[PDB]
Design a protein around this ligand. Structure first.
Ligand SMILES: C[C@H](CCC(=O)O)[C@H]1CC[C@H]2[C@@H]3[C@H](O)C[C@@H]4C[C@H](O)CC[C@]4(C)[C@H]3C[C@H](O)[C@]12C
Ligand SMILES: C[C@H](CCC(=O)O)[C@H]1CC[C@H]2[C@@H]3[C@H](O)C[C@@H]4C[C@H](O)CC[C@]4(C)[C@H]3C[C@H](O)[C@]12C
Ligand SMILES: C[C@H](CCC(=O)O)[C@H]1CC[C@H]2[C@@H]3[C@H](O)C[C@@H]4C[C@H](O)CC[C@]4(C)[C@H]3C[C@H](O)[C@]12C
Ligand SMILES: C[C@H](CCC(=O)O)[C@H]1CC[C@H]2[C@@H]3[C@H](O)C[C@@H]4C[C@H](O)CC[C@]4(C)[C@H]3C[C@H](O)[C@]12C
Ligand SMILES: C[C@H](CCC(=O)O)[C@H]1CC[C@H]2[C@@H]3[C@H](O)C[C@@H]4C[C@H](O)CC[C@]4(C)[C@H]3C[C@H](O)[C@]12C
Ligand SMILES: C[C@H](CCC(=O)O)[C@H]1CC[C@H]2[C@@H]3[C@H](O)C[C@@H]4C[C@H](O)CC[C@]4(C)[C@H]3C[C@H](O)[C@]12C
Ligand SMILES: C[C@H](CCC(=O)O)[C@H]1CC[C@H]2[C@@H]3[C@H](O)C[C@@H]4C[C@H](O)CC[C@]4(C)[C@H]3C[C@H](O)[C@]12C
Ligand SMILES: C[C@H](CCC(=O)O)[C@H]1CC[C@H]2[C@@H]3[C@H](O)C[C@@H]4C[C@H](O)CC[C@]4(C)[C@H]3C[C@H](O)[C@]12C
Ligand SMILES: O=C(O)c1ccccc1O
Ligand code: FES
Ligand code: FES
Lengths: 359, 359
């Protein structure tokens, strides 16, 4: 049977092999939704070239590439299997991967959805908490694709643009946390401090009104409420680079600070993504857990397993799509409000692209 | 009958009259938990004298003083009336006001609780979301009182140190929001943007691990869930002073930014306060809503009424205390963890003061 409903799973992506690092960086430095640079068309290739060896080495240290596409594919397959059974009125469903900066690109996926002759298309961000830099850029890329090719869409579009507190997402995190807690020595379990760690943002982005940290905070509170506040926690922020001010405290400084203050049993939780990648496999596991924490005299540090192939997570995704379809929503109410200090004219046009869709 | 259980309601306080401004400022600038100054014992009275006229002027513009004591008293009376019926085994209950920087001072309230020969004493912060600079300083003040007086307490202490998502608090906020939405022109209701506004913090405090912004965000998400995301929103931050970096976006810049971008119907919600203060009556209502908003060409701007005398809020307070009593809790799990980058030796001692209390 011909596919009727397409689910476009949006994520930034990561280089599958060390060879893919350069083009990954190049596409990213060319993204003007993500960042504006002087003489950008010339600086982008240069910075990409400059950072490539260092970034290649990081991927080498985790096994030679990003597992994002594998996890995204498995999650997508599980989601589709479920949707075909619980939403027959919209079946057959098909998932499409649209990575922002690596193949398959958002544009390539849209091309394939069109050729497949879908009746309905759903832009399903794989970031549960909205940031204009991630989800925003991915949604902008969809509007721009149609603008650039000078044609209207042939499919009815809509977006699931955020889902920071979906009860099944919450259950998966809480589940993974309890599992990791079971892996601490029993005598230390109650003493464990939970560090929720989300990718930081530079303060220039926070200060223009980015909804990300408030939504991340909502996810954290929902998870802790489900865990009945069994352990104390803090939300901290990782991956800052460069000399500018970013939102803190930093995950690395917090780990060190905790240890210096006698809290030497720490559970790291990657609360802002749904599968592994460099930020967990290299930064958290190698840099912070193996190296930093050893230097600080930690007793036990562990990290909750990423959601990855958890079947309940596939159920979360299917439920999200199912409710979205049944409610006839075009986008969240939140998408109808741009940042109070937004300075990117495409944000408004992208917002309108979704809110104005024919039903 | 002699009071059995005392509920110490902790808040910063504000000057009751213009004459109270100087000593208010003086006590504040002397609080080393709040801030460290060079030659502090000399600079504190000077800065107090220096700011006094300007601050007096602000209070004059709202009617000549802070209403915090009036509202705290009414809330406390309502709370106690309920508590005597909810929990007769701990009755008679009595409330005490412990303001940090004005009479009646935290220390004066403790002296009175001690004289009243209470069996049970509860440090009940009136800030729903914990900040080390507010609730932290108030709890520190209690520990310091006993330490400075050289005597152990004759009462069994515990604390309700935060309550950012208490279901009745959330209902009060949602109710006041709906009531305010009803006051906009019907044709503009759906177009209204909600700006949740909380007091900002300097980034130096955020970056040391202050739990405040994450808890404020939790309160915001709970309120919006209850409202069924009826309007789009942003959490923004007010009251920054001085040249240093603070958490943004600023409420004032956000109001102007919304107006320049065509969102001219705005509902302000003071989400981190439970009664009126200079921050609502002067900063939001006069500076932003009367002056700034008119300059920006706003169509409609309103502020949700503070919780103040809502009898449902009194019910929230009673329910909190009642649940605290029933659970035999000494403090939240969160209090057992100080900031990862805390540099105040007293924080740990105060934490221990509460966690170690005889039951
Ligand atoms: C903070 C920023 C997004 C915020 C923004 O729009 O300004 C994020 C999103 C993708 C990130 C980049 C990508 O993860 C790729 C690179 C990863 C390296 O480990 C650091 C630099 C690196 C180039 C990252 C810098 C920065 O953290 C980026 C750009
Ligand atoms: C000033 C500009 C950022 C301005 C903006 O974002 O619009 C920054 C961002 C990236 C910077 C460049 C990149 O870091 C790459 C180069 C790094 C070298 O150390 C300096 C030149 C170099 C070419 C930088 C020049 C300048 O500091 C840049 C271009
Ligand atoms: C570290 C990296 C490359 C620097 C180099 O080694 O030459 C530089 C190049 C572009 C920079 C980014 C861009 O200038 C865009 C962002 C600008 C914000 O002010 C800080 C974060 C921000 C995301 C920058 C972080 C970091 O300094 C980047 C990613
Ligand atoms: C009781 C002891 C010394 C107090 C004293 O000298 O009077 C104090 C000093 C440091 C404290 C420890 C550190 O603060 C680190 C931990 C903090 C946790 O909240 C309790 C256990 C924890 C391990 C603390 C237990 C206990 O209160 C300690 C060990
Ligand atoms: C350096 C210090 C802040 C650092 C700290 O918190 O210790 C700041 C905070 C308050 C400042 C003081 C107050 O603003 C009052 C005075 C203001 C005058 O403009 C300068 C001297 C003056 C006396 C200031 C000196 C200095 O800039 C102070 C003392
Ligand atoms: C942000 C800060 C607490 C955080 C901290 O400094 O660590 C808050 C708590 C009480 C605030 C102060 C009090 O509200 C009293 C003053 C009110 C005036 O409108 C501004 C200065 C003023 C002196 C405030 C400055 C600042 O916002 C303070 C000091
Ligand atoms: C504005 C006020 C008085 C300035 C003056 O009249 O001289 C000054 C004096 C002390 C200052 C505060 C203290 O220095 C403590 C805090 C220091 C942080 O770096 C900024 C906020 C911080 C809370 C300061 C805000 C503001 O600049 C204050 C409150
Ligand atoms: C349709 C019109 C411009 C048409 C265009 O040139 O393509 C756009 C431009 C500015 C838009 C308005 C502004 O963006 C402000 C409002 C934004 C809200 O999300 C919708 C209503 C709202 C009032 C918008 C309605 C409509 O989409 C407007 C009026
Ligand atoms: O946690 C933060 O530091 C923060 C900052 C802005 C908005 C919401 C937040 O939780
Ligand atoms: S930057 Fe947030 S909507 Fe444009
Ligand atoms: S500053 Fe937060 S516990 Fe000390």
């Amino acid at each position: 049977r011909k596919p009727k409903t397409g689910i476009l799973m949006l994520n930034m992506g990561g280089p599958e092999t060390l060879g893919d690092v350069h083009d990954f960086l190049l596409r990213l430095f060319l993204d003007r939704d993500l960042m504006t640079l002087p003489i950008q068309n010339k600086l982008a290739p240069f910075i990409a070239k400059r950072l490539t060896p260092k970034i290649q080495e990081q991927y080498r240290r985790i096994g030679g590439g990003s597992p994002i596409k594998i996890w995204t594919s498995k999650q997508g397959e599980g989601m589709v299997k479920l949707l075909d059974e619980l939403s027959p009125n919209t079946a057959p469903h098909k998932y499409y991967i649209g990575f922002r900066y690596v193949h398959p690109l958002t544009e390539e996926a849209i091309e394939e959805m069109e050729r497949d002759g879908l009746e309905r298309a759903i832009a399903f961000t794989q970031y549960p908490q909205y940031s204009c830099s991630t989800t925003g850029s991915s949604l902008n890329a969809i509007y721009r694709y149609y603008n650039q090719v000078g044609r209207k869409p042939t499919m009815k579009w809509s977006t699931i643009d955020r889902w920071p507190t979906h009860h099944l997402l919450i259950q998966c995190f809480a589940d993974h946390i309890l599992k990791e807690l079971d892996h601490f020595p029993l005598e230390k379990r109650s003493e464990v401090v939970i560090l929720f760690s989300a990718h930081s943002l530079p303060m220039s982005v926070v200060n223009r009104g980015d909804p990300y940290p408030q939504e991340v905070s909502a996810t954290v509170q929902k998870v802790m409420e489900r865990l009945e506040y069994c352990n104390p926690y803090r939300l901290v922020w990782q991956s800052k680079v460069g000399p500018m001010p970013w939102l803190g405290p930093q995950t690395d400084e917090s780990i060190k600070g905790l240890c210096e203050r006698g809290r030497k049993n720490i559970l790291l939780v990657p609360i802002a993504f749904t599968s592994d990648h460099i930020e967990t496999l290299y930064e958290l596991d190698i840099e912070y857990s193996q190296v930093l924490a050893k230097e600080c005299g930690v007793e036990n540090i562990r990290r909750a397993e990423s959601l990855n192939g958890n079947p309940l997570f596939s159920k979360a995704l299917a439920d999200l799509v199912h409710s979205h379809i049944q409610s006839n929503e075009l986008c969240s109410k939140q998408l109808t409000l741009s940042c109070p200090l937004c300075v990117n004219p495409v944000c408004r046009e992208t917002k309108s692209f979704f809110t104005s869709q024919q039903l």
